[PDB]
Design an enzyme around this catalytic site. Sequence first.
Site, PDB file in Angstrom:
ATOM      1  N   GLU A 142       3.425  -0.818   4.614  1.00 51.36           N
ATOM      2  CA  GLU A 142       3.356  -1.766   5.721  1.00 51.36           C
ATOM      3  C   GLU A 142       2.446  -2.967   5.441  1.00 51.36           C
ATOM      4  O   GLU A 142       2.582  -4.023   6.069  1.00 51.36           O
ATOM      5  CB  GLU A 142       2.954  -1.065   7.022  1.00 51.36           C
ATOM      6  CG  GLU A 142       1.432  -0.923   7.240  1.00 51.36           C
ATOM      7  CD  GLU A 142       0.801   0.309   6.589  1.00 51.36           C
ATOM      8  OE1 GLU A 142       1.312   0.796   5.550  1.00 51.36           O
ATOM      9  OE2 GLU A 142      -0.233   0.787   7.120  1.00 51.36           O
ATOM     10  N   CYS A 184       1.897   3.261   2.333  1.00 50.83           N
ATOM     11  CA  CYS A 184       2.916   3.392   3.375  1.00 50.83           C
ATOM     12  C   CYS A 184       3.837   2.156   3.474  1.00 50.83           C
ATOM     13  O   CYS A 184       4.747   2.111   4.290  1.00 50.83           O
ATOM     14  CB  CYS A 184       2.243   3.729   4.714  1.00 50.83           C
ATOM     15  SG  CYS A 184       1.243   5.277   4.642  1.00 50.83           S
ATOM     16  N   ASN A 199       0.834  -1.191   0.000  1.00 47.40           N
ATOM     17  CA  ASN A 199       0.000   0.000   0.000  1.00 47.40           C
ATOM     18  C   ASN A 199       0.876   1.251   0.000  1.00 47.40           C
ATOM     19  O   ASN A 199       2.095   1.170  -0.163  1.00 47.40           O
ATOM     20  CB  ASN A 199      -0.914  -0.005   1.230  1.00 47.40           C
ATOM     21  CG  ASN A 199      -0.129   0.165   2.523  1.00 47.40           C
ATOM     22  OD1 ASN A 199       0.892  -0.522   2.741  1.00 47.40           O
ATOM     23  ND2 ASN A 199      -0.561   1.115   3.366  1.00 47.40           N
TER      24      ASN A 199
END
Lengths: 610, 610
Positions: free
Chosen positions: A322, A320, A318
């Site tokens: 993570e 970010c 995604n």
Amino acid sequence: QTTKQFSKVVEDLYRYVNAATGKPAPMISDDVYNIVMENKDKLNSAIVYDRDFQYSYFGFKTLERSYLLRINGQVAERPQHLIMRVALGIHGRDIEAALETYNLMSLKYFTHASPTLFNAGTPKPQMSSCFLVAMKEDSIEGIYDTLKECALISKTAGGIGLHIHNIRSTGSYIAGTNGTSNGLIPMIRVFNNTARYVFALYLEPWHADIFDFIDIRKDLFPALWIPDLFMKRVEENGTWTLFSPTSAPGLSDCYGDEFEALYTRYEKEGRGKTIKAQKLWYSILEAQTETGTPFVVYKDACNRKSNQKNLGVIKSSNLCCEIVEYSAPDETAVCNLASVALPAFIETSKTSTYNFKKLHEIAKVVTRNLNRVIDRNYYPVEEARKSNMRHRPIALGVQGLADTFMLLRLPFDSEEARLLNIQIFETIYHASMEASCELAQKDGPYETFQGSPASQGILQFDMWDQKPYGMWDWDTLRKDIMKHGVRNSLTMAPMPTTSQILGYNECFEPNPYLLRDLVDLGIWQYLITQNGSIQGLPNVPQELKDLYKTVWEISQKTIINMAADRSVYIDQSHSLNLFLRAPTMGKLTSMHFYGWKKGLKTGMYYLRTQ
Amino acid sequence: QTTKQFSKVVEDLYRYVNAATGKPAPMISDDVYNIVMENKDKLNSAIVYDRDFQYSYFGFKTLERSYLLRINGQVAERPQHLIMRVALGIHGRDIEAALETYNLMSLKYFTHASPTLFNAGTPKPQMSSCFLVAMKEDSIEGIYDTLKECALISKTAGGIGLHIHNIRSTGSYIAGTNGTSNGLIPMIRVFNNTARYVFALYLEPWHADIFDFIDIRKDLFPALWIPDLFMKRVEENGTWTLFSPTSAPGLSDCYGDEFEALYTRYEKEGRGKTIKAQKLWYSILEAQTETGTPFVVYKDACNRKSNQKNLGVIKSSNLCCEIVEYSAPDETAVCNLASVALPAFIETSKTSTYNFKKLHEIAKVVTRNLNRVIDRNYYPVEEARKSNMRHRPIALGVQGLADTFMLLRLPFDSEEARLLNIQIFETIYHASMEASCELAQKDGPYETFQGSPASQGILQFDMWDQKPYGMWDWDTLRKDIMKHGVRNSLTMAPMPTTSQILGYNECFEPNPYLLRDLVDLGIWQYLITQNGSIQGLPNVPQELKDLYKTVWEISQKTIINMAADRSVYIDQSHSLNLFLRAPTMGKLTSMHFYGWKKGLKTGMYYLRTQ
Ligand SMILES: O=[N+]([O-])c1ccc2c(ccn2[C@H]2C[C@H](O)[C@@H](COP(=O)(O)OP(=O)(O)OP(=O)(O)O)O2)c1
Ligand SMILES: O=[N+]([O-])c1ccc2c(ccn2[C@H]2C[C@H](O)[C@@H](COP(=O)(O)OP(=O)(O)OP(=O)(O)O)O2)c1
Ligand SMILES: [Mg+2]
Ligand SMILES: [Mg+2]
């Protein structure tokens, strides 16, 4: 300036009418409005309003500007009202659970992600943080079906990962027109414009549009989904082949040795254009140096090490970096996030200690919460509902790791921090798997549990071929899981972080603590001038210089080591920000290979430079 | 430089392989390939190759650059091959009809629209010129369904009219977000970007985004869909109200007196923002002066005077403003065009005469052709197939009206031209209705014929409350229609025009003829310098100055009169280009009101200025 009684605030929000149009516009769901009214006295009295003072000025202002519900531009909600609204939106009719969540959040033991704070208990309760979308087909029809899906998702909260590996590159033939395609860049422009009207893009480095892709930022974010083979070819100064997906089908559909075999075969067959691996490598580092991007996530580490590997090949992360979750044309993976506040568990015992037993317990509370969120969530599109309901993945994060180290007087790079780091993550992983196993006994395992690594007794640290630290009893947990299953395919994805609301350092990276210390030494404009660094400062003791180092001052090798340590307890990935003072192609390269060789899933999220 | 035998050229086109990919890429449909092979000797011998010399240098080069099919960048097709390919793609197994069409086109009596020349007889035979698309719903979902539809249409040949009257304007409330919409302009930007990746926009002047809409061009084209009430309010210097569709539902769903009543009621109720009619009027003329746009089409004249009025309210025209056809969310109207070459019917008889009997006959041939096109067409989307198959509208045009006048020694503004204009259009209308009536006897009437004005014996000139010129017997035709029906809801929409291929002036607006005349007077750089105008030139006879006037030199009042005259024979509309030498707000205004009062459907297509 605000009504005190919770049920009354709920009444006002529920009865709200848009004056300009004369339209009733309730700001609370029927479901939650009713629950509040039947529980009125219990709920109104449970709330402790002194706790509104537990917020920093920066913290409260963040809440006020954004999160607190407003009526006619006026803030109606007090922080405690928001917390109770959130507790009820999550728990529904389970008042005992709602009160527990209310208390723990209000005392700041944990918080929930922004979308949850915004939308929990409202009429479109879209509580999830992001969505991992697969490009449906390499055709105008699939592209426009995907575009529509993304527009619909964009109406709600949350970011979008989108993997485009399957779209044919520039100059690829089109049977329909007897013409040639203009590739990824103009297609990306379509998605960008749709984002503006109402975004992280994922691509493997063999794609023939790669050089343009990585230069996108020289607001959509390019992220590389990197096979090991690319890094080997780079290391060895070998060749690298660029393919259109249409001339080399299936590359994004296998990983590891299966990929290397298929790839090598396509090279031999002359299906693509060969270059020098380091040519592309160089362009990547050049783009990262200047823009902070592309992000780097290692496709093979992600897939080999995922408890979702039985679903198929994972094609992206995604925004970010993570989240590592399976996505396909009919399934859009969803990010359901909440974060534990790490300093809340610090306890006097003259020394300070860390209460791991209490962390364990709060981690179990959040796990149950995130499961309720899955069930009570408003899904913007059917692909997302299907995904979440089938594999029920959640992502627990943390905040205030840095704060924790400082409160406990531990330098970030110290042996004591290194150990605490490992213990904290073992605890949270164990707690969340224990809670998830409990839910599986009650409600059954997730639909795809059978055939997963976890069903075979393989937990995350097993897939790193490591033994756990052993603060908790893994064998009993593992026996239970093999017997009863777990309710969630995945548990942990420590995220960016909500961390400013709780007044803690954004996690997990490295000042009231410093200030209190200057006060105690009586020293009381440098930091402004010198940008918050206390080194090279004459009157300050070594112990403070060691404790208070700035992320520019901390070895990136240590950051990478600590990330490698906690990663054995992490189901998903986590965001690794990297900081370079005096950026050099050589130093960047070694940062990448070092993380790569450590077996990291996420090699880099953002590159921040002097 | 090119293979002579037609069947051999067909063989090459059919067997073509894309070398770079190794992919077979046949350029002829199976259907047409087979037909050619079974008819081989008949077809090869029917072709007369001397007729390739009937093209002007400009004409042939146009064909060569674009229309003639190519193999590996080399032109495979001779003009005669293209014509026969087109004839067969249209007629299929009817060889007699194919040969007739082959002969007439090859001798230049008529031609077919560009998409037909391009695609007839190929594997995706998309032969239609444009598509009238309705915005599906005022929601992100309807907008993105419409966007997808338009992307799919864009893969084929042809332009798009799109009416947006139903999309809520800037500042309109959105229940979902408790926010407000940013209106039409950013939505239009989405459609524009999609057009670039792979357009005429229609709006009624009461829409609250109107001032921005008309300034779009200060490549999408704004066109106004103008109710009579707007023009009255302007004339009278009265007020005008702007509504969001959501605060004033249904305005685009009625016309005439029904509209005026509903509109006036919404004004009284204070549902919108009132301004001075002429404020907007002024902005419109300002935009037209500078950009050539917005186009002007009169919504009430279009609807009151349409044989499709039984379907519902017509919400737009197309890019060139000749097409007036019903569109809805499930129905996308299609433009099927072909044009008769008007000068081909000029005959010696020392005087030249015009053969109306032969024009009648060629008009009947084209009508049958356009009906075959409807049935053999490749439809890019289901909405378009549904529309065409239900109402079977066609559009016959013309070219070389100006040429015709000149060959016959008729000044454009003369009483003789005025009469010929009327006779030519009466003939074509009568011929096409006669042919269409014949097809209805054979195949049945179109599905929606019953309840139409034509079923009640009301033909186009009846709806202008005029008697036809009477060169043809309308009573017999009308008796037959009421008895047997017609196969086509609509017949004529004289278009922009293919006119450069046949070497005639683009229709219908006002030089080998001039040159031949200078030669005969022996006079033989002025025209370059003076831009093709022969007035103010000392040595030339008045008769030539009268015959050879330039469109800047012709009264726009005459253009408008002649257009009003032929319009009684025109089912659809036709493109009225206007030319202003020394443009003034006053002169433009009177041009609009003059056409408006004449009862024109299309008031202006482009405004061309000095
Ligand atoms: O037809 N077009 O005008 C067209 C077609 C395709 C186009 C574009 C502009 C980009 N593409 C890309 C989009 C897809 O990545 C790929 C193929 O699209 P498609 O399958 O819809 O195209 P077809 O013309 O239908 O060809 P195909 O039938 O081999 O795929 O080509 C334009
Ligand atoms: O939700 N959004 O972020 C959103 C919603 C609508 C938006 C935009 C940007 C433009 N619009 C326009 C598009 C439509 O013309 C109108 C309504 O769209 P919708 O019905 O999909 O919006 P909802 O939020 O679902 O509200 P509604 O349910 O009253 O229509 O608003 C953004
Ligand atoms: Mg295809
Ligand atoms: Mg709606």
